[PDB]
Amino acid sequence: SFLAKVFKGGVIAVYLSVILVVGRGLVRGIFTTSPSTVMFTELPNADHLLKICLDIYLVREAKDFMLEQDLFAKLIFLFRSPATLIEWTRMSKKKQE
Amino acid sequence: FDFFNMENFYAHIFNIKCARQFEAAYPAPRGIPKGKLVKYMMGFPIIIGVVIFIFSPLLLWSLLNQIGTISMPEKVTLRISIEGYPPLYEMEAQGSNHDNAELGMIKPDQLASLNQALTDSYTTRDTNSILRSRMSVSYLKGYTYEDILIVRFRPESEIYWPISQDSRNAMIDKLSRNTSVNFEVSLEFTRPYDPNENAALKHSKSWLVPISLDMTIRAKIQSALRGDPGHPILIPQSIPAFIQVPNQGELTLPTSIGNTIINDGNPRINTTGMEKSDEARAWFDSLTLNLEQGKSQNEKMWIATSEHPGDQNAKLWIKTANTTYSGRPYLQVVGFIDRAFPSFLAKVFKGGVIAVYLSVILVVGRGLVRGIFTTSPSTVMFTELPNADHLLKICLDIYLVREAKDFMLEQDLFAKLIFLFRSPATLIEWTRMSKKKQE
Amino acid sequence: HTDILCYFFAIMTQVMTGGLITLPLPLMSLFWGNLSNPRPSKFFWVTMITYTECVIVIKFVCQFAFMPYNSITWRTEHQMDPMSLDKLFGVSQLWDIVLLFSLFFHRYMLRKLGLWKDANLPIGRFIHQLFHPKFRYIRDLYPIMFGIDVICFLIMTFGYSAFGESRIPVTLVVMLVGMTLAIIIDRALYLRKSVVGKLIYQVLMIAFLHIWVFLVLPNMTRRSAISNHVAQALYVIKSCYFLVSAWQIRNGYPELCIGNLLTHSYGMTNMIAFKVFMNIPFLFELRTAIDWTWTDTSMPLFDFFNMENFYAHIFNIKCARQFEAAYPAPRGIPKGKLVKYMMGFPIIIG
Amino acid sequence: DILIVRFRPESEIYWPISQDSRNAMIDKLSRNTSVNFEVSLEFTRPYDP
Amino acid sequence: VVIFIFSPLLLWSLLNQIGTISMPEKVTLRISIEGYPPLYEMEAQGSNH
């Protein structure tokens, strides 16, 4: 009578139900990468977008909400057209320069 | 991670190309509407599956409830005693055939007579009598003649009185003072084994009638207990006449019959503003006890006798038997037996069940089903491709190079694939359908 | 619209007593008046008047004392059974304000006759109602029917203890909910210009409802009519559905411009409506499958679902833009202290 | 796992019956009613905390 | 991955742990006529076996 046994079949169901969600979702996401999230996750040099991301905060500190609003559309457009994103995140050249 | 990305890309390309080939392997007139058959050969199935998926965990619940039944008791016993002492009178009735006089069923004649008696106790003017008769008849008619038992105990106790001299002296000396002394009436029913759940269900109930503080009453009780010839110990409002036996727990009194008796017919007292403890016990029967003793002090038995409250033979009472062995009336108790056990898993807050019952219905549809039927507004540039035969070439060629070493070509051809999933213009250019047909 | 009032009061006076003596009143009223013409020819009204006078007379006679419905025996014995003889036979047995619905119906029936005096004054029946109505009135009342059906499904659900004899959820509730969902589907199929289909539909459902409410449910739930205070509401709502369906049947179908009754006004109410429509599970997909199975398309089902998703997305985007534009807002001044505490504060607490 | 229980032939206590119950026994057996015997056996385990 | 797959079985196998109990120490037998005090009652006790 140690906890007896609730329909072992039902136990196995849950025992698998958990094995499912975890792998079919979390583990999948962790090991692997969606065919859509390739243009964003890998970028040769992500130093130009960080400049804007810091600059908007810097402007925010010193008021000037006009520049604060005019520089958010500039960022929102970079995630719209992949050609400009690829152009801007390309690796820098001073080394052979 | 690049390995996993490449394998995912290969799987996607393989699936797309193969789906295109399978679709092309079956020509189909570009125009004529879907045939009536085809539609009913595809649409119909879905609807039925969705409906059964929605309404299945209710069907299984309805099959799972399955309110069970149990058999009626086979053992009854009653014990009358003074508080904190061995019982004065103990009597039991056994049997399982339900035909003997000790434990017998109820004939339809008695049930019909009692039902007729219930209705005529009212008076034309008073509406409270109307409501009381309505409630009492509604309660009585809820049990068929197969769910009512008539228990009959013998007046004489089955065994002698097993008391010592010192305990009797303690009884007398306790009664001498101005302390509080109580009586005790206990009744219990026993069920049959019931294998499925283990154990024999037992129902017991105990009443307590306090003794009056007047010195004369205590003197009479002391004279009776000492063993004097004529002293009929009297206890009022002790044993009921109707008892409801639930499926589990303590015995329950039928309250509607009490309201029908203490109010209709001839009202009995209830005019002194009695407390609620005796308000619900005002329709009980009274008991009297005598001591027979005999030749010696070893033989000491107690004989009990019941008296009805209010007016006797008011047609609301079932006639008793005059016994056979030696002649005095049986002690009769009528029991309404309830045999509708629903403890099958009982019920955890049905609301909580419904919550989970819906919680599951939610995740499945709001996620899996959605993904399966329908398509994200983002995954259109990839899922449908007019001709996915050029990407499969690269996907196979990278493996072919991998087999023959040459890791330089192996690495220089992975960026070529990674760039095709970056710029949609080149993807659309490359996956466009081929031209040799009109070429 | 006094005739609609007469039908409504006939339904009320039938549900008030729940017998079969009054049953010919609504049965005949529906079958004849709601299917004949805009004007039942002024002879049907005479028949209704005569039957109402007769029923008033007999139910006044049956409310006497020498006859066996006394308070001594019969009332007490038959108080609990739902389908014995006197409960079953209309008015034959108390009532505080007694029955006023029949009297009010009679008064309004004579008011209708007086209004008829004030103004203006069976193969042929089907031929007139179906083939020669002539002035087709082009209207489209289906959303009202859907609202009525939604109101009834929840009353079948939220109220479940009455339909069953913690108690048991009962196996019959499942049959009722499945059957009601099937009727909801059947409405959708018959929304494709099938007048004779709708006529057979209405006859079948009126017959089924009338027999089931008064002759089967009392035997199942062990609750007599009048005492069941929720089934009467279902009867009334279904009767309103029957009246509007009869109105639709008598007139001609409209062009039926395909589209939800949510894509006409681009307001804030449509947002809540569409959001609850697409938020509850197993509804969008069910509606899409029901639509595609019984409408003339050329694309397979997956393209149908993709198109519906695209339409929903476009509708939501455009409507959100309009709602945002409907409230001008100074481009510059920072968020007011109130607004912030009228929005931020709530979230934190939740 | 096998036990050999041995009860004494003689009963441990006397017969605690009254005259009236014995008369009831005899009179019930006199008629053509149905009368049954009864043999009951029970084992008791240790506390098991 | 292997331990994640095969752990909730290992924990089940450790969790079962079929227990044991000790043998009875009290027995009794009662022979009677139906609906009457017992004719013969006898019990046997002991724990040393």
Side-chain angles (χ1 to χ4, degrees), chain A residues 36-86:
Chain A
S36 64
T37 67
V38 156
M39 38 211 312
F40 302 129
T41 56
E42 47 94 22
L43 286 176
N45 157 48
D47 78 329
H48 301 127
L49 314 187
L50 187 59
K51 183 169 71 172
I52 304 184
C53 284
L54 288 181
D55 289 345
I56 178 189
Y57 285 177
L58 167 141
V59 156
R60 169 97 58 67
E61 183 280 335
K63 294 326 168 209
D64 288 62
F65 299 120
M66 293 177 182
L67 285 167
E68 183 280 335
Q69 219 154 357
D70 281 301
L71 294 175
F72 186 51
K74 195 148 124 66
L75 180 74
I76 213 67
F77 188 79
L78 268 163
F79 290 167
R80 263 188 106 180
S81 159
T84 48
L85 180 52
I86 282 166

Side-chain angles (χ1 to χ4, degrees), chain C residues 318-334:
Chain C
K318 148 83 156 183
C319 183
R321 308 294 146 220
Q322 186 173 355
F323 163 72
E324 198 98 42
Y327 299 101
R331 181 179 180 274
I333 284 101

Side-chain angles (χ1 to χ4, degrees), chain C residues 22-88:
Chain C
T22 185
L23 186 69
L25 249 199
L27 259 162
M28 164 99 182
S29 147
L30 273 147
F31 273 137
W32 210 300
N34 240 4
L35 287 89
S36 42
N37 235 16
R39 278 79 57 179
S41 92
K42 213 193 179 275
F43 159 72
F44 173 46
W45 303 115
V46 156
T47 315
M48 287 222 309
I49 292 197
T50 37
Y51 196 89
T52 304
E53 163 250 298
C54 180
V55 79
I56 274 189
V57 154
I58 165 177
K59 83 173 131 192
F60 158 73
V61 171
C62 290
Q63 186 173 355
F64 259 79
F66 42 75
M67 59 163 30
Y69 326 122
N70 50 29
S71 189
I72 312 168
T73 288
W74 193 95
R75 187 82 62 92
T76 278
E77 309 301 325
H78 293 44
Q79 101 196 354
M80 70 216 294
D81 65 47
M83 213 197 55
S84 98
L85 188 63
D86 142 18
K87 44 210 308 174
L88 179 149

Side-chain angles (χ1 to χ4, degrees), chain E residues 12-31:
Chain E
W12 178 255
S13 71
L14 295 174
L15 295 174
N16 291 104
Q17 200 69 20
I18 166 178
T20 52
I21 49 196
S22 56
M23 71 162 41
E25 52 253 49
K26 182 163 215 320
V27 185
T28 181
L29 163 152
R30 293 182 183 174
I31 292 155

Side-chain angles (χ1 to χ4, degrees), chain A residues 30-33 35-36 38-39 42-44 82 86 89, chain B residues 1 4-5 8-9 12 368 382 418-419 421-424:
Chain A
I30 61 171
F31 296 157
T32 200
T33 59
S36 64
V38 156
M39 38 211 312
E42 47 94 22
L43 286 176
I86 282 166
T89 56
Chain B
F1 287 144
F4 275 89
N5 289 17
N8 268 265
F9 296 168
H12 205 64
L368 177 63
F382 302 129
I418 213 67
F419 188 79
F421 290 167
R422 263 188 106 180
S423 159

